[PDB]
From Swiss-Prot, chain D:
Additional free-text comment from the UniProt record: Transcription of the operon is maximal in early exponential phase.
GO BP field: protein secretion by the type IV secretion system
Location within or outside the cell: Cell inner membrane
Induction record: Specifically induced within macrophages by phagosome acidification. Induced at 37 degrees Celsius in minimal medium, suggesting that nutritional stress is a regulating signal.
The protein's name: Type IV secretion system protein virB8
Keyword Mitochondrion among UniProt keywords: no
Gene that this sequence comes from: virB8
GO cellular component: plasma membrane
Part of the full-length chain shown: 97 to 234 of 239
Membrane topology category: Single-pass membrane protein
Superkingdom of origin organism: Bacteria
GO molecular function, one term: identical protein binding
Amino acid sequence: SYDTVRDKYWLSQYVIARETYDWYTLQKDYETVGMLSSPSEGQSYASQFNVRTSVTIVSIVPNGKGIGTVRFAKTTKRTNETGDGETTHWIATIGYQYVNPSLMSESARLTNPLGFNVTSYRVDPE
Amino acid sequence: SYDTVRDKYWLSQYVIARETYDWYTLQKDYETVGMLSSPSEGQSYASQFQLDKQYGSNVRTSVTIVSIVPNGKGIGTVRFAKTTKRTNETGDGETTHWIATIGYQYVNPSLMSESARLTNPLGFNVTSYRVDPEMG
Amino acid sequence: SYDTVRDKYWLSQYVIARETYDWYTLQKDYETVGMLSSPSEGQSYASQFQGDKALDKQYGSNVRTSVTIVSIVPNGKGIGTVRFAKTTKRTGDGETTHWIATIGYQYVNPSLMSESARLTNPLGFNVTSYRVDPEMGVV
Amino acid sequence: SYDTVRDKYWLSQYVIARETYDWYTLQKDYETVGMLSSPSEGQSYASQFQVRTSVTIVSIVPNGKGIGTVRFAKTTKGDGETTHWIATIGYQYVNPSLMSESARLTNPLGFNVTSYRVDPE
Ligand SMILES: [Cl-]
Ligand SMILES: [Cl-]
């Protein structure tokens, strides 16, 4: 369905924003994560604060009631090695809902026009 | 009355589709749940198959509807048994009893796809579905 | 895969923005079509709210056309098909018709947009052809 | 607030029901967890379900928006072994008519846990 397509896109965007490490996009990624997170999950993410980690989304299963499961890989390279480096696999378990986009900043609403908000997020090894 | 007959038919069709596991009806059962559900309930059902490659065609769970009570104001209660047999075997398998409580309405049927509107021209639509064990 | 998810998201967002007529979301819809479209396609949409013909002048606040997305199939080679319903009523159920949008699309360099556009569309989704035909079923 | 008093009570009841091990009450406890759980969380609990362990609630902090943190101890049985834990619990309230009559007698306010995770302290 369309609501599923929607949720799968934003769950995927969230994991990419939150799990990537890229020096030159990190301020932008950090900001994106706050704009897609509820106030308390945003406060909780802020409290966890050259290599490059890239994310591959493998699959996403929303339960249709505000939990989603995202299987994904992270590939961490020392920038100044040749290959793609070490790849590990993970499962994000993500609570989320949609808020009134008027109830956020104007900038937040441009980044997050549907008002998608992660309310909880946990990552476990696959 | 006619609303009661209509509602009782659909509640039972919903429980049968949603609670049956049979490899040879599965595609049809799966599509019926989709046509008859809100997107959230649809996805709630469908997400358990995103179970069939766990069970394949070795397990069959069939439903027996025991009573159907529409409770007024778009809620209905369906008592039913589910019976699971490994597909090899004669024997009765294991039977458990359940109560599905079901929030439902009739939506604009024009919004649905072609095939959905043939099967569900009245727009039966489940917005909440919950199964609890049978007690008193 | 992820590309399918991305494509299907943007294809539907496009059809919702472009086919919806709702006074209270019109300014946002209009702007979203602009961000997601080629100059041609953008002006093709925008042109219907210009001159004395402007659709909003001739509807105002008294008509609402809402969209239900029914299926989205990316067809490969940057073409996608969105089946959808449009439901119009003046402010019962109003009038529902079914439609097929065929959409040529690509991902362009996202720096070429105003920074507003790049916040909303950082991947650079860009529609270069848009056509709606009536639903006929299959055969 | 009252909403907080309410949430602390049901969150504490949930952890008591879900983390206690008592042979003579295990079936009632199992049933209680189902009646206090969303449909999906009830399915998930039932799958993962496979001495006497008693629960002591130490504190309950709801965030006011559907997440609660419960710090608690489990004591298995002189004294026995006590370990310490943190349940992170998502929850909401649903219309009590959307559940069975029996469910609704155990859970009159329609409290539903939508997610549950326990971590060591
Ligand atoms: Cl959004
Ligand atoms: Cl984008």
